Amino acid sequence: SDHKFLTQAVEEAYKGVDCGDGGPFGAVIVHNNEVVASCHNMVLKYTDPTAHAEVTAIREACKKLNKIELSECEIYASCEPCPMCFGAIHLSRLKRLVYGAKAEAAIAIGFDDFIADALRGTGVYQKSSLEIKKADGNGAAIAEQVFQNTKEKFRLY
Amino acid sequence: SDHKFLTQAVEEAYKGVDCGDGGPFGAVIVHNNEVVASCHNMVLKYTDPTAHAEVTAIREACKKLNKIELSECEIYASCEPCPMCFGAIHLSRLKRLVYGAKAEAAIAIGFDDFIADALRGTGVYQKSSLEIKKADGNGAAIAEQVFQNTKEKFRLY
Ligand SMILES: O=c1[nH]c(=O)c2ncn([C@@H]3O[C@H](CO)[C@@H](O)[C@H]3O)c2[nH]1
Ligand SMILES: O=c1[nH]c(=O)c2ncn([C@@H]3O[C@H](CO)[C@@H](O)[C@H]3O)c2[nH]1
Ligand SMILES: [Zn+2]
Ligand SMILES: [Zn+2]
């Protein structure tokens, strides 16, 4: 189940790059193996630097379910969520995060060294409790490949 | 100017809680003494847990200015921005942050013990060189009293 939804997030990333919506990032929120939201980065489309894939997916899942908390839901991010997105994931009460590529994969192609301490376990004032899985094997390979494949197909932000 | 725009943020907090839009939080984004956006928490109105005052202000200012970077602007937050909002302030390239009350004043009335490591300089990975001013004296006292003054007027989220 994990690989399917992670691959869908990666496809969202590729799609958003292709249509010019934003950068190569995708996010899928699921409820017991039913997709509640499927999104990619919309910063360029919306002129909104907060419209990362994860924040967009959280907003859409919360509208779909008509509530502000997603405690029964899990999120799949093609790349390690940034500090803003990890904070948003905390506020939304999502119970589990699965992510594909480490943030260094995005940094290597020109994005900010902008890494969430609370996700990596080095936070002091921010302590996450949600379950977190870094993908291995084929999932990690696909997710990492995203940034090589899309290298100069999009405008950096 | 700092007292004026901090007071505007505080009044936005009271306004939002009085109209039921969200919690007692306000944020004002200013461009060389010209207010670009003046917003409050909209989590309840929008059914959106990311719609904190600061994120709302950033969204509105970016849409109004037709740019995703606010590097000529400053943000005034009635309360110390949370991890998500501090991430958003970083991503938006705002050049200065002035905030009124410490996060503990909001935590005292039941909000999450959820504090931005990068703002307090306690991170391993996430650093900030953003210019950050915590207000003192006058506006700061007024800003601190917001949460005791409003805590029976809204539902925690
Ligand atoms: O979580 C994220 N969602 C995005 O859409 C996105 N777009 C760009 N970035 C940046 O990639 C780096 C690694 O997380 C950080 O500089 C992010 O801001 C993003 N991070
Ligand atoms: O920056 C913020 N903007 C808000 O609108 C807001 N509404 C609630 N909170 C919570 O208040 C505490 C102190 O920052 C944290 O638990 C925030 O999530 C907020 N933080
Ligand atoms: Zn993000
Ligand atoms: Zn916030």
SS3 call for B142 = helix
Whether the CB-CB separation of A17 and A84 falls below 8 Å is answered with: no
Q: Taking Cα atoms as reference points, which of A63, A73, A57 lies closest to residue A25?
A: A57
Domain assignment present for residue A43? The answer is yes
Quick one: how far is CA A140 from the chain centroid?
Answer: 14
Cα gap B13→B26, rounded to integer Å: 4
B52 is in an annotated binding site: yes
A-chain residues within 8 Å CB-CB of B60?
none
Token pair, residue B16, equals 């939002």
**Resolution limit in angstroms?**
2.1
Cα gap B90→B102, rounded to integer Å: 19
Q: How many CB atoms lie within 10 A of CB A88?
A: 30
Q: How far is the CA of A142 from the centre of ligand 4 (A)?
A: 33
Domain assignment present for residue A45? The answer is yes
Shortest Cα–Cα distance, A128 to chain B (Å):
9
Cα gap A155→A42, rounded to integer Å: 12
Q: Taking Cα atoms as reference points, which of B150, B152, B127 lies closest to residue B78?
A: B150
Q: How far is the CA of B105 from the centre of ligand 1 (A)?
A: 31
A31 is in an annotated binding site: no
Residue A60: give its domain's CATH number: 3.40.140.10
Q: Taking Cα atoms as reference points, which of A60, A59, A65 lies closest to residue A91?
A: A59
Select from B41, B84, B107 the residue whose CB has the most chain A CBs within 10 Å, as the one to mutate to test that interface.
B84
Domain assignment present for residue B144? The answer is yes
Domain assignment present for residue A155? The answer is no
Domain assignment present for residue A157? The answer is no
Cα four-point dihedral sign B110, B8, B119, A131: positive
Contacts of A2 (CB under 8 A, 6+ apart): A76, A98, A133, A135, A139
Domain assignment present for residue B14? The answer is yes
Q: Taking Cα atoms as reference points, which of B149, B70, B142, B75 lies closest to residue B108?
A: B149
In angstroms, the Cα distances linking B40 to A90, B37, B129 are 20, 10, 26
Among the partner-chain residues A47, A48, A117, the one whose CB lies closest to the CB of B124 is A117
Whether the CB-CB separation of A12 and A53 falls below 8 Å is answered with: yes
- Residue A10: HSE in the Cβ half-sphere, 13 Å Cα cutoff: 24
Domain assignment present for residue B156? The answer is no
Which residues of chain B approach chain A closer than 8 Å at the C-beta? 43-44, 47-50, 55, 58-59, 62-63, 66-69, 82-88, 90-93, 112, 114-118, 120, 122-126, 157
Domain assignment present for residue A68? The answer is yes
Closest protein CA for atom 5 of ligand 2: B52
Query: Does B114 contact A90 at a Cβ distance shorter than 8 Å?
Result: yes
Closest protein CA for atom 1 of ligand 2: B81
Cα gap B111→B58, rounded to integer Å: 22
Contacts of B19 (CB under 8 A, 6+ apart): none
- Residue B150: HSE in the Cβ half-sphere, 13 Å Cα cutoff: 28
User: Torsion angle, CA of A19/A53/A58/A95, rounded to 10 degrees?
Assistant: 140
Q: Taking Cα atoms as reference points, which of B129, B69, B114 lies closest to residue A118?
A: B114
Among the partner-chain residues B55, B63, B116, the one whose CB lies closest to the CB of A126 is B116
Cα four-point dihedral sign B154, A128, B101, B5: negative
How many domains does chain A fold into? Answer: 1
> In terms of residue numbers, what domain contains A5?
1-150
Whether the CB-CB separation of B117 and B153 falls below 8 Å is answered with: no
Q: Taking Cα atoms as reference points, which of A124, A52, A38, A60 lies closest to residue A82?
A: A52
